[PDB]
Amino acid sequence: AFCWNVCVYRNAVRVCHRRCN
C-alpha cells in the first residue's frame, strides 16, 4: 500500500487527504 496526500481545492479550500492505493 502506497499512501500520499491528495490535496483537493473545493470551496477554494485546500483539503489534503491521506489515501492509500
Short mmCIF file of N, CA, C and O in Angstrom, two decimals, residues 7-20:
data_model
loop_
_atom_site.label_atom_id
_atom_site.label_comp_id
_atom_site.label_asym_id
_atom_site.label_seq_id
_atom_site.Cartn_x
_atom_site.Cartn_y
_atom_site.Cartn_z
N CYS A 7 -4.55 16.59 -2.18
CA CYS A 7 -4.97 17.93 -1.80
C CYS A 7 -5.97 18.47 -2.81
O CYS A 7 -5.60 18.84 -3.92
N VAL A 8 -7.23 18.50 -2.41
CA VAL A 8 -8.30 18.95 -3.28
C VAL A 8 -8.68 20.38 -2.97
O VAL A 8 -8.81 20.76 -1.80
N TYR A 9 -8.85 21.17 -4.01
CA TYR A 9 -9.34 22.52 -3.86
C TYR A 9 -10.84 22.55 -4.08
O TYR A 9 -11.33 22.53 -5.21
N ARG A 10 -11.57 22.57 -2.98
CA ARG A 10 -13.01 22.65 -3.03
C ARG A 10 -13.49 23.77 -2.13
O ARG A 10 -13.04 23.90 -0.99
N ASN A 11 -14.37 24.61 -2.66
CA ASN A 11 -14.80 25.82 -1.98
C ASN A 11 -13.61 26.74 -1.73
O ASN A 11 -13.58 27.50 -0.76
N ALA A 12 -12.61 26.62 -2.61
CA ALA A 12 -11.33 27.33 -2.50
C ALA A 12 -10.51 26.83 -1.31
O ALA A 12 -9.43 27.36 -1.03
N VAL A 13 -11.01 25.81 -0.64
CA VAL A 13 -10.32 25.22 0.50
C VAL A 13 -9.44 24.08 0.02
O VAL A 13 -9.88 23.24 -0.77
N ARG A 14 -8.21 24.06 0.48
CA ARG A 14 -7.29 23.01 0.12
C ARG A 14 -7.30 21.92 1.18
O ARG A 14 -6.70 22.06 2.24
N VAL A 15 -8.01 20.84 0.90
CA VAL A 15 -8.12 19.74 1.84
C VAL A 15 -7.24 18.57 1.40
O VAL A 15 -7.47 17.94 0.37
N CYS A 16 -6.19 18.32 2.17
CA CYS A 16 -5.28 17.23 1.88
C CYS A 16 -5.70 15.97 2.63
O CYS A 16 -5.79 15.97 3.86
N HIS A 17 -5.97 14.92 1.88
CA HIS A 17 -6.37 13.65 2.46
C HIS A 17 -5.24 12.66 2.31
O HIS A 17 -4.57 12.63 1.29
N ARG A 18 -5.02 11.84 3.32
CA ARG A 18 -4.01 10.80 3.23
C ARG A 18 -4.66 9.49 2.80
O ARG A 18 -5.28 8.79 3.60
N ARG A 19 -4.55 9.19 1.51
CA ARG A 19 -5.18 8.00 0.97
C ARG A 19 -4.10 7.01 0.53
O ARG A 19 -2.96 7.39 0.30
N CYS A 20 -4.48 5.75 0.43
CA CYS A 20 -3.56 4.70 0.03
C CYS A 20 -4.15 3.91 -1.13
O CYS A 20 -5.37 3.88 -1.31
#
